[model samples]
Target: VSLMEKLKWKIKCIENKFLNYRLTTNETVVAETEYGKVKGVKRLTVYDDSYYSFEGIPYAQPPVGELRFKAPQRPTPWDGVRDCCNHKDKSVQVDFITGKVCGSEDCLYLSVYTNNLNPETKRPVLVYIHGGDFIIGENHRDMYGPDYFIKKDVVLINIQYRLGALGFLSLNSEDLNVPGNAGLKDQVMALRWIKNNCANFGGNPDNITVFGESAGAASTHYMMLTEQTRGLFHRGILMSGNAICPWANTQCQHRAFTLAKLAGYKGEDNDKDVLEFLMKAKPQDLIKLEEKVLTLEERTNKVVFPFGPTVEPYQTADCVLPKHPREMVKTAWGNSIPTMMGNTSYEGLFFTSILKQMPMLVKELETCVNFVPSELADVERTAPETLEMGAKIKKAHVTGETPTADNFMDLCSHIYFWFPMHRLLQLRFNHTSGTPVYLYRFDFDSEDLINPYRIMRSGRGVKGVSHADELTYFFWNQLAKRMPKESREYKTIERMTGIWIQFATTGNPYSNEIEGMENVSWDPIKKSDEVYKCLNISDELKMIDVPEMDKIKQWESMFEKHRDLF
Candidate 1:
């Protein structure tokens, strides 16, 4: 074995000794706190550190049965040692692939992992929220396991909130007591629970960092704006998601109305009644109902999901008005916290591959443009239309075109994937100036997964990176099959992991430890140049000029015309 591997093994041995000691002597000792005393599991890290992991701990009561659509409430205190090593029941939702069994309404649970049990010393805490577009995903995903973070000397916590229709159906007057966005409320309650109980798990409640990707990133954005989460976390890291100027409000009501109509509920303007009735129905029935109402194509085209967070009136006892997230950020409500946010390079490729199967002609695309608002339509027309945009974007790439059968697929990637995320990032930097912000563009590509269109031989598939591709290196795990082990990739992982941990430890992401790796130098993203760091995976990290990406800033100004509609 290499000297590095030997050192890693030595660390694991030391960590194991601590674990054994804790298991034999410290296991029975209960840590009492303001919330209550709770038992925890004794675990040995690969480095042999005595670590404690408390899983499936209740942050809120299960929002099941009559409580299905209600806001999450504080979890009731329990007696005796609750076995929290395994995950609790998940919320009911459709599986992404099978559209079958997934979750349960009683799914409000959070897990904690830590190294130290002392509450006096203020150690940094990292809270991770999983992402599945508000429809799927849970804290139980193995990729999010805290072993790596725990080894790095940080407290790690993962939370599972409500998902799908049960978590996001907007209610009318009769159902006001139990409204929409229970999923988001569940997250708030989890944060509250952390604030109150983190000390017990050897975490500094005050030094919390909220981080997540995609939907989870959006949740962090929403939490930033909510009064309930104002003091819960000190900083936030938005990975590939943000709520900027427009397209920030919750559209759950419109989605619910469409879903209700699709579910054969023939009520006149009574979306609440339809939603209430559907709540009593089986989870499978709801999935079938959603399927009957809209095909995958229709849903994808319209950007309609069966569920998502909604803007609710009086979400909590303290907050009365339905606050728009963008408005909150504009008013500097949640801008006090430092933020780190960015998008991946080939975010659009993931969606394009799936949607390219749909028929699209230039004329049909022009007709589709009319469906959008006049201002947005004009922007689409003047800007590179779908066909032209793809060729232009691909020409910048080393490979001229994708190996996919349909060249149109590449166009879809530019329209749906890359443009939307780029626009959001542009808006964020433009709108908020109060807080220091760090922006990055992830450009690491993996070669383990074969190209889908390799047979076509149009081009080798190395340039296009998908939405969640950077995650493997960031979190340092093999959750997805596409990401594989490589020496260079591993070095990139170590570099990124160090950067992320540094960001969590200190407000700034720059670390002196990774200085020699790729001659890495991180500069803050300036609104003037619209320039940011691009984390490219190479033998050594390199900084390159990305002034052309400034076009995203121009795109944001154009999107302002459709601010009201979004």
Candidate 2:
């Protein structure tokens, strides 16, 4: 044989031998990152597909001590190979379910999962930024495993950045050097680290797609709009949240002082003094103050997230959100990147459990005019016009009937997730660089698998898709068991993961190569279309007009009429 033929034969034999070794043994694999070498372990998916998971690789120096509220810096390089077999601590925040302080302040790590470690095998990458209203979420495998994505020919990354006050406590004071959006800055740094190091894990840095749900999706929307996140990702899939959501961004200048006061600071209550006190305070104390920092009005209005992304007071070198999200979307440079964004069918049903837990909130919704989203309630809360407008909004959705569970959920679903996302689509369609912007409505309701609304018993048996229900199909979480092959939920998993893989593989989400989606010709919303086109994702996938146009237009006209106040 010729020299080339002999070399190819030998390489094939070695590759086969390595594959055999991995299948038979609990093998460890190592890859070189920019900071240092990381060691991972071989694991099997629910399908028993083998892959490598490198968890708890720091993307930045631990955001502790002086770095507590600061933007993340590059991770200090380490000596020797780092063991990445287990996930590190998540960011310190109030636990969503337990309602207690959990996690660590030193939480800026990311996990990488891939099927191949060969540098030459350049697979597309999907980096997930989790959703917890920018307060209570993490990238732990129990909640967000890489099983679904790893089965496809791609690399999956799950990131945990700062959360709650630790993640986003902005005084908006450039002099004090607290410009906010530190959580977002941490994500940007993580993206940079991935771009520089993912090639070693068989990922194509140039073809990365950033996707997330709720707060995570809103983070992706901000990252897509801001100059700081430019060139870090090529495509984005925003699920159930966007920057324009009223709850997504807020002014927290007063919150800084409130947090300090809640922390028992008796010193001069200036920004400088507050910053000093906060810097020296215990991390758990600050996390515990998440709820106490909010004003009574904020609480009554259900503004649970006291801290989140805010517009930088002024544009500094490292400002992530220099402009408001509405303005940012109008002139965003990332508009050219292919995008897919949508919401669940009954997003507000996700909150039914909260309404039940806090029964007072249910009564408040009926008697108070504060059901108007904070975005549109820019006027004084007690102002005549504000109250009138809020009442009009309530009447438009609920008619004259008393606020029932279904009506309340509809009101919330419209004003919070649905309207903001609809507005984002219109803004994006107007400004995009001729790239197709796909929209979907996840409407499939199943009696089996890990349904988030069912787990919470949301809406008291009202049947529809609620926020985070679609995640069951995308991740193999702790709540999930081996779904039978004949189950539609299993097929939904195939469909969900398949389309997501196709979107990362190609700009378009629909591809013949994806097994169950072979005949699905999903179309993107066009600028000329008066009624926007959307793909209704159910057992049967087909193109349809965006649902509930009347309610969406009610919000549209309300905002238009009160544009000046907002």
Candidate 3:
């Protein structure tokens, strides 16, 4: 062990003294919510400090049986104290990489962690949404641990939502009667649950920060876009995904239909039959449905996904999303919350690595002009019919190089990750005037993989920071630890944890106590500067010039010629 590791990590809190409590069953304190009381356990940390953890608290009732394919309904109150010790099952679906299906229909749940239960303290609440390309994931302990945030006197909540066909299969039915975005509805309901009960967990409902990675990030953007979600949150953190990404939202009827067909449901005469037939099928069979709706040529030409968020038709009833994200961008009417958005240096690798066989996922190349149907992900609807958009992309990033995995990673990173992040930053800054919008690039490298080792091992077989790599710095994460204290990675972890807590507590990431942040300035993005400012996070952190400037300008030309492709 290194000398730094040899030293005891005595958690010396500046404010509170350490106290270990031993209690009988009745002595165990439970946090009471609007519904009922639930008990949690006190866990010991590396430094022997204590934090309370309440897991498996349901935010919405099970989206099963009669509820399948419908919007998420607020959970009815349960009687007596619910045992929340075990985590609820994750959303039912198949993992994109492994093709393995897990989880349950009764999965709309959340977990909360707090260092102290004193409501007067009003600690900032960090609500986490797990990511899995709208297909898989859960608010389980592995992906998001509580140590990093709670230790900083912040309360953390992790949420689980419906996924894939069940959550995203759009009906295109009567307004508000059969609207889409069931997954997004689950999110909105979960936020309401947190707002109503966070105070009991020592969190300030008003100071809640809704944050997530990948699909979680996209969900955060949707929360900002939808009118129903206003006043639910005050700040947003989106990492590695954006609402405008070429694949975030798309056509899902074929996927939904195929799922029904595979599950022995024939043709549907009307919307009611469509819902009843599909709902009666086995959930696992629905997950196994993977009919190819696109050809290889289409795969290379457009960005596509089977099930995801989609623009609901113009609706008079409660709307979950708009007709077009770009149209909404102009209005900039999303809940005016301060948002921090960005991606990893190698954000595209996640898809490039696993999606080779899943070519339908690589729908259209989407090398078109920007600013169309605002939700830029749905190429079939939003991406405009264009001229020669690929030439500029080919010359700029794909020049003279054969399509090897390495170069493809680079090419796709710009198109799907880097460029989209720039566009999201641009839109947020252009709209939502005066609300501080922060941006960042997670560039630190680590050997950890948020995937199975069978999938290319992390730190090898990949380029710059892998997807979800930054989360390890904030939590022990599901796969790895934040390296020993002696290494450079450890300092980066400590610095980021401090910065996260600082942002959660004060809405700004810089503070004197945050090492090296004292001299660094993380300016909220401003368009007048012409150069978008973003905090560069690596072994050494600093405020750096905008990233992928060339790609951004190149896309600007595309936007100019083929306007409305945004």
Candidate 4:
């Protein structure tokens, strides 16, 4: 550690004592929601800043038995005060670390954290949607603690929705009415609940900003495109994911059928039979089908298992995604919202473990076009033209004959994260006006304390900011043992949270008045140079053209080649 780091820690300790006394004095509190009155506890956040917490507040009815695989319904109203002092059960999911199935089916709850309970305050509402590739994640404080944002004068709400097959298994039958995206519907329900009740917790309902990391980022982008979310949120922040990500939105009928067969169905091979079999399957069994549902082609491309957002065959009153996202981007509804979006320096580094396990993927990339995004590839993936295009992509990104994780990592990042985000930004710029779209590339590199990707790639020798690394800067996660107030990492925390909270509070991300950002000037991208102009965030923040423009153009032209087919 540097001498400056030690001095910064000393100053933070002193400031913390002052802040603790000024912010919190109460232990427990009560607030009224649309359903009924609920009691919450006033507690110290991970950063030791005081805030009020209302945990495990149900936003919808339990999606059990009859409600399973259907749009979520409003929660039953309570007659008296309910205690929201502890977290309720999260949605059933296979643990990303342990692989053990955990959580419960009765999990449609969201938590609220705010320093002010005065309804008149009307602070900006920042509703967070956790991301786990649409398979595994929760709103638990272990990963998304409220200390950083809470200390910054914002009201934060973390929402938990269904994941895996339970959240995204679509049969596409009119009679069955399981149009998929029930997890997204669950999110819409939570947004509706927040809009209706956030005022009671000192949040501005009309100024809500729905934001997320990975799958949650895609969900937020999906929310932007759908009319169902109209009037529910004013601003959006999508980080590291979007609707156009090939794996984010896909055809799941095959995966659904695969799950049914895996569940031991012996009847007809139709939608009704599949739905019936799935409805009867145990929640644990439904979630465990996560890894079993993916094909080798999908696994090679780093596709998060099979269950995720899919296009509804037809638009209905309750449909979340009525049309394909590519078509939706051409419309005016979603493009009009003020948006801030970006990805990290090395999103693929998060998948270093998987990439190392599949040395064959690197070999396969040299021969076939399977590595090409399904959206961008021609109708026939194995077509000579498609394979020709795939070789061009491989030659540009992968350098070595037997590529290392670092070389292969860029291919993963471009196909999954970087390219998709730029595509969304360009589409939004062309289709909308008045509201600005801010884009960024998080380039900060932290090797100690936080940056889970760095810890995961410990001895592999790969470097660059990896996926979800920016979260540590904005959130006081479980691993954030300490942050010296004036240290570089702590300054980054202040800048990242400051920039995000600024965007949530106002429509813009940059403001001269925000602390730690007094000297920073970040202007949103304009039509004249939308492709190039973006904020590159690191120890120093600079506005420059996005990195690897040539590689991005390669993907763009590949998609352009088969544009009419889509």
User: What's the TM-score of every candidate structure?
Assistant: 0.78, 0.90, 0.85, 0.90
Model 2 CA lDDT for position 371: 66
Using lDDT as the measure, which candidate wins? 2
What's model 3's lDDT at 361?
A: 35
Candidate 3 lDDT, 1-566, residue by residue in tens: 12332221112111112222221122245789998889887775554456777889988778887788777777788778888765778877775334467878888889998878774578888888877788778776655667666667889899888887878877656632556778888898888898889988888888988788878888887777777777777888888777877778876544455556666777864666767787788787776674353446545655466778888754634567766664566564453676777777776565553556555433233442332223333444433333245555545555443434544555666766667777676666666668787878788876543333213322345556767677777764434443556677767767877876677777777788866677787888776767777888887778888676666677666567445554
Instruction: Name the regions of candidate 1 deviating beyond 4 angstroms.
Output: 1-35, 44-50, 244-250, 254-272, 293-301, 313-321, 359-375, 378-434, 447-463, 476-486, 515-519, 533-539, 547-566
Please, what are the lDDT tens digits per residue for candidate 2 over residues 176-195?
77789899999999888888
Q: Mark the regions of model 4 whose C-alpha exceeds 4 Å error after superposition.
A: 1-26, 295-304, 365-368, 375-382, 400-402, 451-462, 514-516, 559-566
lDDT of every model, 2 decimals: 0.60, 0.80, 0.68, 0.79
Q: What lDDT score goes with residue 104 in model 1?
A: 68
Clashing pairs in 4: none
Q: What C-alpha lDDT, on a 0 to 100 scale, does residue 334 get in candidate 2? A: 77
Tens-digit lDDT track of model 4 for 88-128: 88789875444479999999999999877874567899999
**Per-prediction backbone clash count:** 15, 0, 17, 0
Q: For candidate 3, what is the lDDT?
A: 0.68
